[PDB]
PDB file of C-alpha atoms (C1' of nucleotides) in Angstrom:
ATOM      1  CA  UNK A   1     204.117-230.005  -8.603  1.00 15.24           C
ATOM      2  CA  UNK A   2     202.957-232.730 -10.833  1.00 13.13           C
ATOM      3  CA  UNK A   3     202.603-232.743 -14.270  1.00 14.38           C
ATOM      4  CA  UNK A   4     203.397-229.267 -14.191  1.00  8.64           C
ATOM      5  CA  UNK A   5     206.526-227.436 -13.617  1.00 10.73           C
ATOM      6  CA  UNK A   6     209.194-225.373 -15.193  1.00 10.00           C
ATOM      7  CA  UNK A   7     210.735-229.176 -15.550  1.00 10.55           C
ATOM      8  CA  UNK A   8     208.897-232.105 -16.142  1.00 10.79           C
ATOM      9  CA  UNK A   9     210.320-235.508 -17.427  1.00  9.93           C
ATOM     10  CA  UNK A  10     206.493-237.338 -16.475  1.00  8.98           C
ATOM     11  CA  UNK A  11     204.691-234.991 -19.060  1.00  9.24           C
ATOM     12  CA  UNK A  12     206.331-236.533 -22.313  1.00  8.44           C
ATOM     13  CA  UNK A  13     205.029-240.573 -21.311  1.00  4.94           C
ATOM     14  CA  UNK A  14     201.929-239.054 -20.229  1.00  6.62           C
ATOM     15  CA  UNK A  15     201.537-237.401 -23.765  1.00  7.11           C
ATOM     16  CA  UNK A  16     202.718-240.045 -25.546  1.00  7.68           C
ATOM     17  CA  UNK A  17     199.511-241.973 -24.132  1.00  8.48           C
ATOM     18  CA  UNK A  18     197.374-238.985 -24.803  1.00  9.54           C
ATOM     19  CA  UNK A  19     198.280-239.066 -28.420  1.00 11.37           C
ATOM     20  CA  UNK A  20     196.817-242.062 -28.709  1.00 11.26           C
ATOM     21  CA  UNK A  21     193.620-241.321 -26.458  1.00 12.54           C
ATOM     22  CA  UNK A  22     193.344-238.203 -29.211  1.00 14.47           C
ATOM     23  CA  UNK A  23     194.609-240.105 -32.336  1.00 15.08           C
ATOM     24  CA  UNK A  24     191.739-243.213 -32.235  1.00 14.15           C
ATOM     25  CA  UNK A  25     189.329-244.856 -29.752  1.00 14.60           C
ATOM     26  CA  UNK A  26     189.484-243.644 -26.172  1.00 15.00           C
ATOM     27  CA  UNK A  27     190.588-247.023 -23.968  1.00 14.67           C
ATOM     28  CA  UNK A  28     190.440-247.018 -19.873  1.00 14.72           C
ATOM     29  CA  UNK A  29     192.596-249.984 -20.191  1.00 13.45           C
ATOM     30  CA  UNK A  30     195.928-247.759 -21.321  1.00 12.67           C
ATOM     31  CA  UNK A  31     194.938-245.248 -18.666  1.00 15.80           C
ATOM     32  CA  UNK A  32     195.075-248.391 -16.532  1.00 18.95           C
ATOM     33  CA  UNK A  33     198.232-249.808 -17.632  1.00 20.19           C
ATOM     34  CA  UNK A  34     200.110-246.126 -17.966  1.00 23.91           C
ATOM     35  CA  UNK A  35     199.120-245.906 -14.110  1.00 20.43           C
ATOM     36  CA  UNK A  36     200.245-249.052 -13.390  1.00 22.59           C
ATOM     37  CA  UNK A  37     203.659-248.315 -14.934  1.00 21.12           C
ATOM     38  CA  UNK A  38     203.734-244.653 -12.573  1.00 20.64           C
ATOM     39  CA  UNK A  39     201.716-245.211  -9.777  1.00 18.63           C
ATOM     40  CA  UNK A  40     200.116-248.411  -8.282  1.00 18.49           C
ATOM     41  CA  UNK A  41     198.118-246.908  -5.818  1.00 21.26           C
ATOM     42  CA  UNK A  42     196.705-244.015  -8.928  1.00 21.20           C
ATOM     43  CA  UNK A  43     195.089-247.349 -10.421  1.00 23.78           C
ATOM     44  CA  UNK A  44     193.448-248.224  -7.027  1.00 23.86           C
ATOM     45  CA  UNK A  45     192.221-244.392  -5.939  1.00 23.55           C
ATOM     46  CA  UNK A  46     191.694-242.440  -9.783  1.00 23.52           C
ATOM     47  CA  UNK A  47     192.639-239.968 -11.661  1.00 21.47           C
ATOM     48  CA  UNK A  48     191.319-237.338 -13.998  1.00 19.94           C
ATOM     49  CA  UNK A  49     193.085-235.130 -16.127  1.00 23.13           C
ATOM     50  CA  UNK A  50     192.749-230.721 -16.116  1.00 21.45           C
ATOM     51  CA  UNK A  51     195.363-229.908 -18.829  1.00 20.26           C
ATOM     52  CA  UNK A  52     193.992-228.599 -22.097  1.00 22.27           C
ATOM     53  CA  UNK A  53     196.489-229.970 -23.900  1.00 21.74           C
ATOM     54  CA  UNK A  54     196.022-233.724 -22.672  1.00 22.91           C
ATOM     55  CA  UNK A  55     192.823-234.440 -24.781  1.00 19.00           C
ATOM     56  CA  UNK A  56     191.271-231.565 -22.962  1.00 20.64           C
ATOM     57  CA  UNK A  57     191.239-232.683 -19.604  1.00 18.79           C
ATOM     58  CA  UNK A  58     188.655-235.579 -20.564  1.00 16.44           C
ATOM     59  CA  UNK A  59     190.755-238.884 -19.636  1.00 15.51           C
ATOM     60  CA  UNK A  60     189.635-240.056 -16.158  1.00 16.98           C
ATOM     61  CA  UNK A  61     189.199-243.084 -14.120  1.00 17.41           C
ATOM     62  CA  UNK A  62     187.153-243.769 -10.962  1.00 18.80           C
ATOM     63  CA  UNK A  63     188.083-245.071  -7.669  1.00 17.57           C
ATOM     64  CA  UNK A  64     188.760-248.777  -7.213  1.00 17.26           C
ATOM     65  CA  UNK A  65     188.085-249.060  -3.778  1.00 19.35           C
ATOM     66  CA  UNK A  66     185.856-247.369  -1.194  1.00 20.63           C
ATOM     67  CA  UNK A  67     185.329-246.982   2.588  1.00 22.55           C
ATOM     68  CA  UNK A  68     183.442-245.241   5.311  1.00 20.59           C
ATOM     69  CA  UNK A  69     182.228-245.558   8.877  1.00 20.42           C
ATOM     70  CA  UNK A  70     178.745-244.734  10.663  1.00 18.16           C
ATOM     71  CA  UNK A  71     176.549-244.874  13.539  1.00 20.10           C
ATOM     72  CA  UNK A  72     172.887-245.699  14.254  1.00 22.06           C
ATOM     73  CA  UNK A  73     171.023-245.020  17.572  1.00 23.33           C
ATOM     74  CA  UNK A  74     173.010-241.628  18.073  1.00 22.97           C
ATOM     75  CA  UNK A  75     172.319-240.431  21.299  1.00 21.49           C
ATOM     76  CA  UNK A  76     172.926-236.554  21.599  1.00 23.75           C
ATOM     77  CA  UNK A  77     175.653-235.022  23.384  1.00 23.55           C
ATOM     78  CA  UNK A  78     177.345-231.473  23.084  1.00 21.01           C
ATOM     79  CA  UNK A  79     180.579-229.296  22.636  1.00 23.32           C
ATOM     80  CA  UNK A  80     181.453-225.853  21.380  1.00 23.94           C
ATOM     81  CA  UNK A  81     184.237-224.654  19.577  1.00 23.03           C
ATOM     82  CA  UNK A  82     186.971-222.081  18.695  1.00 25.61           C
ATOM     83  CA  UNK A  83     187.892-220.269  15.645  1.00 23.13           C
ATOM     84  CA  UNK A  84     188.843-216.683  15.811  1.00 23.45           C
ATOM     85  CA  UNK A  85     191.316-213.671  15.530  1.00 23.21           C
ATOM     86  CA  UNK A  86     194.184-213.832  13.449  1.00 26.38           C
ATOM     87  CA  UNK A  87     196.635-210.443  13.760  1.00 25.55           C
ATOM     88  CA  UNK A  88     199.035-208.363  12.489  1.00 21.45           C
ATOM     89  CA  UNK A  89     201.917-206.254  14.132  1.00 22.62           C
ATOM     90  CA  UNK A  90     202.717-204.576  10.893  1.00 26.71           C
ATOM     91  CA  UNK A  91     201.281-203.954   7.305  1.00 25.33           C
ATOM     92  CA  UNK A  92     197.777-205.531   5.699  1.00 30.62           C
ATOM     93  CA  UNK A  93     195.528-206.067   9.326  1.00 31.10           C
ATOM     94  CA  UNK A  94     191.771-207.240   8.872  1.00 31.39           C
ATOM     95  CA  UNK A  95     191.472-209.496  11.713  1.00 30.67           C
ATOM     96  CA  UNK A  96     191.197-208.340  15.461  1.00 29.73           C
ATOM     97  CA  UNK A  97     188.007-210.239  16.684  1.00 28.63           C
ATOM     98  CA  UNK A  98     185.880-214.007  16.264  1.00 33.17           C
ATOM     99  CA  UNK A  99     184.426-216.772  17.997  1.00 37.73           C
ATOM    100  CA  UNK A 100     182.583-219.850  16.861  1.00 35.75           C
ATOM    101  CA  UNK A 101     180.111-221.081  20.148  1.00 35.99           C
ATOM    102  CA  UNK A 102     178.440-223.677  17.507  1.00 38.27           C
ATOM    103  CA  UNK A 103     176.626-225.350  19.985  1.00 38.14           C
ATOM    104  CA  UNK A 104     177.845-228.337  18.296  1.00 35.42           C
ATOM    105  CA  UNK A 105     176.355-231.732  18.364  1.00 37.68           C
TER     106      UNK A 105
ATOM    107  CA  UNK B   1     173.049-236.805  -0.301  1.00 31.79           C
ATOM    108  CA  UNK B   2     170.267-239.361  -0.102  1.00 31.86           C
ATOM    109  CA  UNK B   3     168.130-241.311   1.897  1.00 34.02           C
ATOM    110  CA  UNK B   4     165.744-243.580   1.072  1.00 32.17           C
ATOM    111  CA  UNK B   5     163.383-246.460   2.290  1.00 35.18           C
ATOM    112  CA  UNK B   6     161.956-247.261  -1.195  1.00 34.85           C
ATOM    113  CA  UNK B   7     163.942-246.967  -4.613  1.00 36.06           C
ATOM    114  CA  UNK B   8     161.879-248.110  -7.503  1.00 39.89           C
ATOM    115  CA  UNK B   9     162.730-248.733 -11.218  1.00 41.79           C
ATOM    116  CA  UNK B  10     160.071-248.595 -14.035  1.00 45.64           C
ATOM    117  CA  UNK B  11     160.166-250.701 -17.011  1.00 49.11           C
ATOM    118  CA  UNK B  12     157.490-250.207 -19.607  1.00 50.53           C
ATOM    119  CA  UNK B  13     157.532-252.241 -23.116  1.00 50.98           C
ATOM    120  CA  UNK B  14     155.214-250.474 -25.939  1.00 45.40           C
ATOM    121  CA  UNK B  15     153.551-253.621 -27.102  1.00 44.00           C
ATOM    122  CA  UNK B  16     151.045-252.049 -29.074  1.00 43.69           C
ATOM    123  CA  UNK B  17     153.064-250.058 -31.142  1.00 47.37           C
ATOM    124  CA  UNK B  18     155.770-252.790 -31.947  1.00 46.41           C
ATOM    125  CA  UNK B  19     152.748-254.373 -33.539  1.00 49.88           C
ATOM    126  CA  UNK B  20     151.255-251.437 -35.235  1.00 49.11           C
ATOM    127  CA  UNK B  21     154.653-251.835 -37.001  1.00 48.37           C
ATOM    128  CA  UNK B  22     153.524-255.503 -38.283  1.00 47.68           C
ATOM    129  CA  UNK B  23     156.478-256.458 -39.528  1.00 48.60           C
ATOM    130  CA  UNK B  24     155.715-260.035 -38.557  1.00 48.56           C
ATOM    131  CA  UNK B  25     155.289-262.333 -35.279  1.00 51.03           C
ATOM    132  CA  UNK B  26     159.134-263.572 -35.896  1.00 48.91           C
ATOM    133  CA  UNK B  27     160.175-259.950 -35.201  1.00 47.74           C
ATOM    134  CA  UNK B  28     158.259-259.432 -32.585  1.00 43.77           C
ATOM    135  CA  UNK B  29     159.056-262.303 -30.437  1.00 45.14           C
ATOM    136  CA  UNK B  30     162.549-261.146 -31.234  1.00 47.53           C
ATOM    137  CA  UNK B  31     162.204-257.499 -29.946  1.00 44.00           C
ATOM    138  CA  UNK B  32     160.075-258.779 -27.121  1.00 46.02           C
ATOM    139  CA  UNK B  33     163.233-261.419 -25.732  1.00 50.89           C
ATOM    140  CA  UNK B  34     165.610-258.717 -26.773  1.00 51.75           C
ATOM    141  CA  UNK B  35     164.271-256.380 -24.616  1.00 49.44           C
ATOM    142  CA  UNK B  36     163.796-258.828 -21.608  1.00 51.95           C
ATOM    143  CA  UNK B  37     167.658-259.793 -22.225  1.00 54.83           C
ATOM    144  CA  UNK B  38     168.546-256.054 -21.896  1.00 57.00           C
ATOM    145  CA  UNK B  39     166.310-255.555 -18.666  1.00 57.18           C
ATOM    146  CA  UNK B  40     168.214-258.855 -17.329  1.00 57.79           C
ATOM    147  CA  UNK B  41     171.229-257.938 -17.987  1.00 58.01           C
ATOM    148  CA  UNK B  42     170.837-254.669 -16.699  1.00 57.38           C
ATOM    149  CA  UNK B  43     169.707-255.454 -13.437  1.00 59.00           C
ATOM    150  CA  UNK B  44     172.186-258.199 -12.506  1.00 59.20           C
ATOM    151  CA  UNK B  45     175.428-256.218 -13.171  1.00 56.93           C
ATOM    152  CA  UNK B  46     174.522-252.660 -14.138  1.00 54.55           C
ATOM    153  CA  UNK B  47     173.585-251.260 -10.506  1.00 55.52           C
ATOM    154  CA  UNK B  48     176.542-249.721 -10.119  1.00 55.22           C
ATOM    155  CA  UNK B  49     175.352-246.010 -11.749  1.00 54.99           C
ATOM    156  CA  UNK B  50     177.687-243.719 -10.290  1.00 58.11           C
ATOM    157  CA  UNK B  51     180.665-243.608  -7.856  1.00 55.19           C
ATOM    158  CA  UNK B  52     178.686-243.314  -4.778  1.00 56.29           C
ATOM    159  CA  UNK B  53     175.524-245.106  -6.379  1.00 57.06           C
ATOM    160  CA  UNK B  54     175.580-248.608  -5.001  1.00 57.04           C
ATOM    161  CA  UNK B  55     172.855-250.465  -5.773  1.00 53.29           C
ATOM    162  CA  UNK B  56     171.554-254.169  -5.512  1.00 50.32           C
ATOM    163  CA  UNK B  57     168.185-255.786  -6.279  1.00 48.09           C
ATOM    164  CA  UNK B  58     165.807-257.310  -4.199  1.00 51.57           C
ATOM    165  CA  UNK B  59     163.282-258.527  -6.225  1.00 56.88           C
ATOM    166  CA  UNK B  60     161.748-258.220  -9.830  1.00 56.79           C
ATOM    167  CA  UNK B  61     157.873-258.772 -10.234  1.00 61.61           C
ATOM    168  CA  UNK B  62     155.929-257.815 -13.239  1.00 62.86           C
ATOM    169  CA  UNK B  63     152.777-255.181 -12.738  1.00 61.37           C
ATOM    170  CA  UNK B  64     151.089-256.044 -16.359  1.00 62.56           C
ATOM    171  CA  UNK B  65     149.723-258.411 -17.670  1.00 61.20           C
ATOM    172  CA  UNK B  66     148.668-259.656 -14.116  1.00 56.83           C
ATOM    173  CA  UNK B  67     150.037-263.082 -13.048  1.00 56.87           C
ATOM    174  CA  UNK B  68     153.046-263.575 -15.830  1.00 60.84           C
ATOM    175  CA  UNK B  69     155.889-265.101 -15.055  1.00 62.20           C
ATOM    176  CA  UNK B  70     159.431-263.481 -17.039  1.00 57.13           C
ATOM    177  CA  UNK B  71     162.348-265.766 -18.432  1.00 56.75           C
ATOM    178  CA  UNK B  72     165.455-266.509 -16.800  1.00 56.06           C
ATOM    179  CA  UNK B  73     168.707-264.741 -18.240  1.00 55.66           C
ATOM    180  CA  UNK B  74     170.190-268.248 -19.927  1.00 57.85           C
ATOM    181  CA  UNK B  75     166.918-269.137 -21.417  1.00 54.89           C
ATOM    182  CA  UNK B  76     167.172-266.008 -23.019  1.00 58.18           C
ATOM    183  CA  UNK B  77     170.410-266.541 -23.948  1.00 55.86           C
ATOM    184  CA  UNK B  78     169.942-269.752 -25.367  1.00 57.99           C
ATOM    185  CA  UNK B  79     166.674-268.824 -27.554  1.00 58.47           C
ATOM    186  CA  UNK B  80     168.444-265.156 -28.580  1.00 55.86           C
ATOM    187  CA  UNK B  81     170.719-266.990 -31.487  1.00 56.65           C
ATOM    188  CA  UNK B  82     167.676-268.968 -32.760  1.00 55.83           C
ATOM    189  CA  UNK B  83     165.491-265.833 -33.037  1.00 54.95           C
ATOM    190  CA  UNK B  84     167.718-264.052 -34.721  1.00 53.99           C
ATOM    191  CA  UNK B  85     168.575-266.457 -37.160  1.00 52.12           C
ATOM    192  CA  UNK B  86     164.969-267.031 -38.117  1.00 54.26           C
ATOM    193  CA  UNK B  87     164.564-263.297 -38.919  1.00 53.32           C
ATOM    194  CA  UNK B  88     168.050-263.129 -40.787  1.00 52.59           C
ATOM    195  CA  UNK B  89     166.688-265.944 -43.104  1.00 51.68           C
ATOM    196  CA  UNK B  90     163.346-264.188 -43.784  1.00 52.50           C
ATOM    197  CA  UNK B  91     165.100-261.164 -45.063  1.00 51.54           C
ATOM    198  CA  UNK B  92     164.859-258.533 -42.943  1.00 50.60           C
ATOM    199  CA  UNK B  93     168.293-257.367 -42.370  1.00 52.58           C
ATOM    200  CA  UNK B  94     170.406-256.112 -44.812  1.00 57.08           C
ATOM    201  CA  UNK B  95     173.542-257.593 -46.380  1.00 57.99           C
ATOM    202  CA  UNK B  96     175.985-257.591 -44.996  1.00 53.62           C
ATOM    203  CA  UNK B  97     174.601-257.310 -41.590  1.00 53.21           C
ATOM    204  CA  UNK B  98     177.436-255.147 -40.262  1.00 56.05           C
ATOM    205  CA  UNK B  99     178.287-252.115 -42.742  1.00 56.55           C
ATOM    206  CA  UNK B 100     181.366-249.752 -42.721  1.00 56.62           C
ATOM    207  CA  UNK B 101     181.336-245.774 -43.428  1.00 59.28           C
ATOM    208  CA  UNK B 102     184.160-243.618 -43.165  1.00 60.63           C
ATOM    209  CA  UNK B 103     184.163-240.372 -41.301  1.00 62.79           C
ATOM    210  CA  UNK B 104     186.299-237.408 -42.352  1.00 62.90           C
ATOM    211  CA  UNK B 105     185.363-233.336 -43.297  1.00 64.95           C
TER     212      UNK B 105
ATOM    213  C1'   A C   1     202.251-150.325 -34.821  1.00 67.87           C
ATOM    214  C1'   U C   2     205.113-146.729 -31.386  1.00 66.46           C
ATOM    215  C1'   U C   3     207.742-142.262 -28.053  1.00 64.96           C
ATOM    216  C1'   G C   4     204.711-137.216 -26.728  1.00 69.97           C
ATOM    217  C1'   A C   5     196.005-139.574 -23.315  1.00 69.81           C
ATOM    218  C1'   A C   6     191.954-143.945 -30.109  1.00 74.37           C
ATOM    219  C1'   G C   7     191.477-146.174 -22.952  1.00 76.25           C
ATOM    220  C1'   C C   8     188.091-141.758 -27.882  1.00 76.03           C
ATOM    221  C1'   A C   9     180.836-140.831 -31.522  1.00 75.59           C
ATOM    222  C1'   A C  10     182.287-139.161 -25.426  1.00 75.81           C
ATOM    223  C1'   G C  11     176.663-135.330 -22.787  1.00 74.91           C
ATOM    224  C1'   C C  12     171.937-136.544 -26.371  1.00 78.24           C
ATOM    225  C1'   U C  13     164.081-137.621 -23.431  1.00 78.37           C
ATOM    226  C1'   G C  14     159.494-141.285 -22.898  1.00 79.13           C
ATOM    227  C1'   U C  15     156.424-141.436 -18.221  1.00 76.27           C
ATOM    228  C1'   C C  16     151.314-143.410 -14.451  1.00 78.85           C
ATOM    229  C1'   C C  17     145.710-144.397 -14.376  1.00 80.82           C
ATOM    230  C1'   C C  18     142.148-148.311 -16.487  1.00 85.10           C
ATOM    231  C1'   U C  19     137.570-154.812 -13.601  1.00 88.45           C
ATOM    232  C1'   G C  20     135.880-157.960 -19.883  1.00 88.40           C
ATOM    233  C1'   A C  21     131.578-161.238 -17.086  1.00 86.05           C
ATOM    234  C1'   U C  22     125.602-163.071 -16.820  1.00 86.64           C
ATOM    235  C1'   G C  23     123.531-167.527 -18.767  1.00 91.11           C
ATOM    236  C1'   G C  24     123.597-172.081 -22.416  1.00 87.89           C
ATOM    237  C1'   U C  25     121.382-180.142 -20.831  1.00 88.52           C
ATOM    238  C1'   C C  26     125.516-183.645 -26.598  1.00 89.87           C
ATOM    239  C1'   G C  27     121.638-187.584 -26.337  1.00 88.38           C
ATOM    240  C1'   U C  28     119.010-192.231 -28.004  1.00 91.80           C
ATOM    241  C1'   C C  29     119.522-197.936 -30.884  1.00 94.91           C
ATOM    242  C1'   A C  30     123.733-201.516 -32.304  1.00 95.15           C
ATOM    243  C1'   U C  31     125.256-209.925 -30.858  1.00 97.52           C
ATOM    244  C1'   C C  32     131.464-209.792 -33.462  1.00 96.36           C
ATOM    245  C1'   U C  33     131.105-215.120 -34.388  1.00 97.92           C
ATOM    246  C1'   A C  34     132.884-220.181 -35.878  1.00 96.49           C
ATOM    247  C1'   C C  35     137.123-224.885 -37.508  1.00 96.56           C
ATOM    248  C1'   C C  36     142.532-226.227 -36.199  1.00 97.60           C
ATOM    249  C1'   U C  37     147.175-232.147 -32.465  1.00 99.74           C
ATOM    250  C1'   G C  38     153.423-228.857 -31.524  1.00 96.91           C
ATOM    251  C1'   C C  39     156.768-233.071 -30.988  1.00 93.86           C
ATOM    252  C1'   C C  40     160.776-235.740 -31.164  1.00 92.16           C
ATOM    253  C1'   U C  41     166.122-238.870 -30.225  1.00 94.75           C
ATOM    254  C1'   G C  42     170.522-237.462 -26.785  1.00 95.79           C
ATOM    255  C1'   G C  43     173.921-240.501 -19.496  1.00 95.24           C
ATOM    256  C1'   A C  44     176.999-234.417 -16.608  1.00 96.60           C
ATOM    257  C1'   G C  45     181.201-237.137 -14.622  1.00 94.45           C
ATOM    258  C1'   U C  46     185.602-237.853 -11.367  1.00 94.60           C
ATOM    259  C1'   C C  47     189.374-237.315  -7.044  1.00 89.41           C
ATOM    260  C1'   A C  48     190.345-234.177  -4.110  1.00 91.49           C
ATOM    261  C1'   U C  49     191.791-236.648   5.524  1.00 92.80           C
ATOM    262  C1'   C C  50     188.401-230.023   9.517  1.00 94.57           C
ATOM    263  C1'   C C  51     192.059-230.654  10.938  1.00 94.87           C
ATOM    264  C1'   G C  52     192.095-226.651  14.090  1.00 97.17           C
ATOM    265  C1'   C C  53     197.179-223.304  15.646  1.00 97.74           C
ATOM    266  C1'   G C  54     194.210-220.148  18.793  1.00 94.39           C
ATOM    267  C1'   G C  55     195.492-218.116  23.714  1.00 91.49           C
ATOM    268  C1'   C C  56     199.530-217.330  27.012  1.00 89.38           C
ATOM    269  C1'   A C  57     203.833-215.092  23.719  1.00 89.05           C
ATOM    270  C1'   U C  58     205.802-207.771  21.658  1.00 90.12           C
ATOM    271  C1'   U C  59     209.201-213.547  22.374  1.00 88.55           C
ATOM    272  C1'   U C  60     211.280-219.546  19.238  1.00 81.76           C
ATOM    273  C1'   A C  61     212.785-216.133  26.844  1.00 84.45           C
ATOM    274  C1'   G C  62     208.638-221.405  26.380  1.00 83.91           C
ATOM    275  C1'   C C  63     203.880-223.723  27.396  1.00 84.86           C
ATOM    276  C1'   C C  64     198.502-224.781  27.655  1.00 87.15           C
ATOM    277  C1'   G C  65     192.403-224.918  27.396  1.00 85.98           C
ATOM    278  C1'   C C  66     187.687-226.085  25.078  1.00 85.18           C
TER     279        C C  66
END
RNA sequence: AUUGAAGCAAGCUGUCCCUGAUGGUCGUCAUCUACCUGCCUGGAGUCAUCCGCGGCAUUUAGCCGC
């Protein structure tokens, strides 16, 4: 949806910066400041770049910021689960039976 | 991904063969602070290897020679300039230190 | 090539019976052996919420478990 598209007015800046990123040294700090000018959380959470036409895909930029959550001393409890048949009245039918017992943790 | 009580880095400095070279005691004590600036600098900001990697450092000791004792990171920096300017004057480098080449098919 | 037969050198003679096996010594000696460096410099990296939409429903007639 993004940076690709039968329309696109955000490709054109984005090559613009590219030209340069081809045309002399490679600089993180005009990735950094072309982010800032689109997106102020892209500078914060990273980027890399897939087109072949943008320098091959090989601009990127690493997360800012990081976070997680975790637990020490676990004591073991358990639950199951359910994931399972998904049918069809009419046309293409593969599914008509599943379970998932896990035995989860 | 990983878990573990004890992560250990290795540094080993080929004494031997930096004098085998015998290029003089002013270059060695120059390749032998150089490399204890690198390992400084190294481990007080380079721990961060990889997105995930998070690393901090506990303690540096020294294996061998038993019983030495390694510079601080300003001491190093302050003798670095010194060291280098003694070897400039005896000759060693080339003039001009710096030299340009131009890269093209 | 055809109406009134080339569809035409068409009928022309070769049969059954027979025991090929007894025995020969390919066997003794031989030394394959010694010398050599593989190695060497080079970042794989980066961001992307497991939730569950199952069942009951032919069901937007309408809800409910782990």
């Amino acid at each position: 949806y993004i940076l690709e598209g039968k329309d696109k007015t955000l490709f054109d800046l984005l090559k613009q910066e590219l030209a340069h990123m081809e045309e002399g040294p490679v600089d993180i700090r005009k990735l950094a400041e072309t982010l800032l000018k689109v997106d102020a959380n892209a500078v914060l959470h990273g980027v890399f770049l897939a087109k072949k036409e943008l320098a091959g895909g090989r601009l990127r930029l690493p997360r800012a910021l990081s976070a997680f959550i975790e637990a020490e001393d676990v004591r073991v409890a358990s639950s199951g689960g359910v994931k399972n048949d998904h049918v069809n009245p009419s046309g293409d039918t593969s599914r008509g039976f599943g379970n998932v017992p896990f035995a989860r943790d | 991904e990983y878990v573990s009580p004890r992560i250990k880095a290795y540094f080993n400095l080929d004494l031997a063969q930096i004098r085998a070279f015998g290029l003089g005691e002013q270059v060695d004590r120059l390749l032998i602070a150089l490399a204890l600036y690198k390992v400084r600098r190294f481990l007080v900001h380079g721990l961060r290897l990889r997105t995930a990697c998070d690393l901090d450092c506990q303690a540096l000791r020294v294996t061998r020679p038993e019983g030495w004792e390694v510079p601080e990171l300003s001491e190093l920096e302050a003798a670095l300039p010194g060291l280098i300017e003694a070897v400039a004057g005896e000759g060693r480098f080339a003039q001009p230190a710096v030299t340009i080449v131009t890269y093209e098919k």
